[PDB]
Design a protein around this ligand. Sequence first.
Ligand code: ADP
Ligand code: ADP
Lengths: 346, 61, 201, 662
Amino acid sequence: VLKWIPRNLPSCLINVESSVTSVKLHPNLPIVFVATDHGKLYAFDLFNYTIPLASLQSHTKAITSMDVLFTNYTNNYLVIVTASKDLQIHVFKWVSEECKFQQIRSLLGHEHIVSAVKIWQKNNDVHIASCSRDQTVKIWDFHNGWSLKTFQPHSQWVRSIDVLGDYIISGSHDTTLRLTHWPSGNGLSVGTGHEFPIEKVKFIHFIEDEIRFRTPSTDRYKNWGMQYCVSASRDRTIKIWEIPLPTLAPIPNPTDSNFRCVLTLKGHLSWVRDISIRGQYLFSCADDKSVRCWDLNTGQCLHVWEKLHTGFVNCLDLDVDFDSNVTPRQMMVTGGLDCKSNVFMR
Amino acid sequence: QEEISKSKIEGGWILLQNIQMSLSWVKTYLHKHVEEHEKFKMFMTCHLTGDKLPAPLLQRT
Amino acid sequence: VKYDVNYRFIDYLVTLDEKMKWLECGLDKNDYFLENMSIVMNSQDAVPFLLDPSSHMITVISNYYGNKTVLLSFLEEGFVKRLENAVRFGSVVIIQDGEFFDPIISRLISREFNHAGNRVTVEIGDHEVDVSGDFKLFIHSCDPSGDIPIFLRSRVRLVHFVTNKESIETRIFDITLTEENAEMQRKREDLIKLNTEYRLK
Amino acid sequence: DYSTIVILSFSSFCSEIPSVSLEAHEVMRPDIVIPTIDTIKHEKIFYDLLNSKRGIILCGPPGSGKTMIMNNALRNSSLYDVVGINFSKDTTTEHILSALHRHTNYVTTLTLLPKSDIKNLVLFCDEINLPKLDKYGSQNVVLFLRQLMEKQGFWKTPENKWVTIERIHIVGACNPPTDPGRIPMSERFTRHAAILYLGYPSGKSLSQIYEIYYKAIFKLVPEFRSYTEPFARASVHLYNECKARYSTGLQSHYLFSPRELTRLVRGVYTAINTGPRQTLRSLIRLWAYEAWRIFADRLVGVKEKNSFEQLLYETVDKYLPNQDLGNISSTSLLFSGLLSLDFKEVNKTDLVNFIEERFKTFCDEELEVPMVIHESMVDHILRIDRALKQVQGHMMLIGASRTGKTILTRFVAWLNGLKIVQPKIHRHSNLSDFDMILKKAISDCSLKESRTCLIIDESNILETAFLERMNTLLANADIPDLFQGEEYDKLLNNLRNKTRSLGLLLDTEQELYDWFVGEIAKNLHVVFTICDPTNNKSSAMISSPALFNRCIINWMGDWDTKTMSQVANNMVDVVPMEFTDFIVPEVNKELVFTEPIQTIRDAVVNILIHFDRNFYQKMKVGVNPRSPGYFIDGLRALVKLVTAKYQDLQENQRFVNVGLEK
Ligand SMILES: Nc1ncnc2c1ncn2[C@@H]1O[C@H](COP(=O)(O)OP(=O)(O)O)[C@@H](O)[C@H]1O
Ligand SMILES: Nc1ncnc2c1ncn2[C@@H]1O[C@H](COP(=O)(O)OP(=O)(O)O)[C@@H](O)[C@H]1O
């Protein structure tokens, strides 16, 4: 049930009045969430796509990225966080009673445009991660509405981030990756080697379902909480990277302050925009009007979705499988620059 | 320059000889000075067959 | 393709209120001068080049913007710092001796601004600086038929200022009225101003 | 003619030719020589004269191969080392001493010995004629070399003490004085040096050498190995026809040489090596594209371009009789490495759309200039990218102002990851500021290992010292007088630290400097932009021997009427202005530059193009390139003014109509 391949044709088509920049999936109900370059934010249905459920203009400029999360507590609603180019981060509310969008709070703190926003929950507390063009990635608190840590881990501004526990990555414009611990506020190790700026970078999560790149190697790496990271850049390449284990407030190793290229995956004809992980497959998109599917075991593209869009392909996602609180539904959706979005059913 | 400043402050005639021979100076400093006392008269002598003096200085004299 | 049979540039672009403002500032009565002044004022994208050998437009545009304008030159020390402070403040800047062009301000001439959200910044010298949005750049050069760099000549709007027959006639007739009958000329100019104000009203 | 002595028995050169089996990738090495009769004969006699302790001056037409015969003779011997000095229009004695200070030591026994105690040094000097006469007709460099060989030494300037030259042989190279740009040469200096006339190789010899080159190239494509001879014959015939047709009388930069054909061979190798599976039509189109990018870029007039196209058609038909040949116009050969993983032909529309999206990204990221994309500018992007991807790949863009030269260079440099560097040279900037910015650029290229696309505008050069610095930077891999004494020693320390940081280990200064200059040649591209080629400064910049022999001259020129029509339509297509009745006028075919008129938009672009033509005709511009900045500015002001006027007129009419209705 974790070995699903999407079919060669889209199940149906979703049309947006302007170009699509980010698409997200509702974890519980079959609802697709679509962003828009013109500032719109659509919310379609997986079966009735004739009319949007809710759409509004909260951002005066182009939306950059967004992600969803459903609240859980030990003592029950969906949160959508949307970033844009208007130097503002907007956190929304998706009520299930009347299926409408409610603005929670419009938040500031970035002197330039904000690229990537990440939302995660730990021990019945939901937090916001965000990186922008001001050379600083910022970790936030949702209830307080204020920042928690601010630092410059790179020479210039950063593209994308992802959070696994208390450790955060940051895809930067200087072809580097950096792990910076939140409570200590220091860099762990520096990883470089790319020739073009990073477009999307995210963690590799351990699984217990055997995938080579999704299993622990040593006991030290099992205790650390992370072993691998995947980075997509404009070098037309997807690279799996190695994170040295620090002396866990971890202390960086002077002789092991550099990363290691575990594997280099090549075969895209243009920049790799966004990537996704599902089982042993490394789903990826690019600007060559195509979507690939790379096996972590072999490093070869098993399927090619040629001419999926008429133009560039912007964003795609799957459902998170490492978390048992989210059902691993077998849905896939990919958004492109041709003002269209397509879903894949079964 | 010092004598031009002093003779502007406290008066007195002043005369410049062969101003075509310091073309950079007459293009910058004298142009700035004339571009921007009651008994102060400054005379400039020059050669007709020599180098071309700047137009705005001649139209401002 | 159709066009107006008795079209006039002044009757199309130079509106009556702007004409009143220009004539109040000290602009001459010439059709040529009015056309050139409207040409200069209608260039909000590319900076205009003024070539006025009589140094009249310096005080004309100085009187247009009041006391917020500042006069700079390419031959004065610290001109870069003065322009830096002026673009920080956001005041209209007129640069004198335009034929001695300084290639530092080539980013300002080409309008190659780097937009940073709601703040627009430009890289001049060796460091960036914010642009207030009220900044207006004028380049003045009192030397006619001089040498101009090809970069500046291509990227600015060259506007000449030469004296024609009507200017000579108007100046001579005004001078002889002032020297012959001051009261008659005063009544004439007061009636002209009153008639123009009445038409505007 | 072929008499020689082998080890006291007379023989000939027929059995002395060594068989050469060039591999595919050996063509990129610049030291590769094809041993023919003339090459081996000249190499042997040059080496014989050199061992006789004499000066050698190699006189010949440009591209005849003086430097390559030199390097062929001196590579096969450990006795001599080559020092590269390349003179400019105004070269001084201090430049010669600085290019020798790195290679020599001052020992008091003064005495200027070479650093190596077993190897002699050959002080090469190219373009001896290029130093200019004084007010009274004398040359400092030529008389310095005459002193350097006749008296074997020179007088040092600061401490006025006489030095003695021990093991510094002198080898010169110059063009005939009949060639424009050269001056008569004093007999008091030419007496001390023997002269060799290295002439142009014959057509058969060139055909054989380049048949060998194409065998080496087509070793990559085994199924087309039997077609190696017609390609060489066609290339040699094309070179001969281009030399005979386009002469110096038409344009001053129509100086062709076998170096152009070698660049053609190298481009063919690069395209084949970075290419997909190839067919005969693909080879014909690729060879035609390489010929277009090597020979026809320097052409100015449209008539010369059409003549070159017809000549290419005639050559292809005559020498390679293959059918199914497509159109070989300039814009119909779009070979790209952008849209795919390899250098292959691409369609027009998808390439244009890709350029649209990437230019949108570039405008969003680096700087916002709303440029309109047309086919000719796409072709210029492709040739600029092809020039930039090469190793040691420089370029000299020539065209009218506001053609889009520097912005295109920035866009292409951003596409390939090059870090653009522009000097902040302005008024009140001496030679020291330019020296510092070049030193910083060189250090960033070498120590920091950063890809740098340095841009030098014509206005960025104020005095000829900057031009000579660029000449030395292009001709060699670096410039000698940047690093002297303490700066030289600290750069050696920094470069040793960088080398041991990388992991590579060597101790000799010479090999470290070769690594340094190789890194500079690999990670530094210089792009020139010239606005008015009729100026004396621009003419001297173009006619410089080092700038001519290395840069790829890309004569973009003024905008033709097709480009103007394309940009006009693609910029005014967003204006609501087709709100009136139009009668299609009865006009001639030659009177309309655009498509035949059906609406008002084509009439608007036609009347604007016609007014630009009339205005530039009436200004007595002659053959001076015509700036299209007026056309763009007028069109933009037209768009803004018609939008404002339509809004005001609509508001006024609506207000008066509702007032009358009320
Ligand atoms: N075997 C050969 N015989 C003659 N010429 C050759 C041979 N091999 C290559 N060449 C040509 O000689 C050129 C090198 O000439 P070069 O030394 O640069 O001339 P110049 O000294 O005038 O700059 C090369 O471009 C190449 O095309
Ligand atoms: N096709 C075009 N459409 C609109 N503007 C253009 C076009 N080509 C060039 N330009 C103008 O030219 C300018 C850039 O030219 P640039 O390369 O800087 O010229 P130069 O190299 O002579 O300095 C831009 O500001 C742009 O407005």
